[PDB]
């Protein structure tokens, strides 16, 4: 029952597209994305964190 973001299919779209460019975007890109898809920076920071973990293994 702890909070848990479900991403729109649009924002999931933009996250995967960005991850495709760099696997380590800088803070400003992250921010710019956040505005562009209505999530806060921290949600994106974690997404990228988790997503990278997936990739590595």
């Amino acid at each position: 029952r702890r909070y848990r973001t479900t991403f729109t299919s649009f924002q999931l779209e933009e996250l995967e597209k960005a991850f495709s460019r760099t696997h380590y975007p800088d803070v400003f890109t992250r921010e710019e994305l956040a505005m562009k898809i209505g999530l806060t920076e921290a949600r994106i920071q974690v997404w990228f964190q988790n997503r990278r973990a997936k990739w590595r293994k």
Partner: protein, 78 residues
Amino acid sequence: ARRIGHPYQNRTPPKRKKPRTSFTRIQVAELEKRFHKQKYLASAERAALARGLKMTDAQVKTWFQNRRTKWRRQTAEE
């Protein structure tokens, strides 16, 4: 004010050695209690806080650093 730092790929790979500790709820709840009235700890008083929660110095120092990160990320997360 943004004071950005250095990218991770350029760093030399970590040496995690090692053990994955997890602080007891009393350890935790004391830390949180102190945090509420004091966001920064001078070294001597960090030493005392640790010595009295049977944690190391590094551990309290790191806990404090990680707490502040959470704190700000919460503060300015409106």
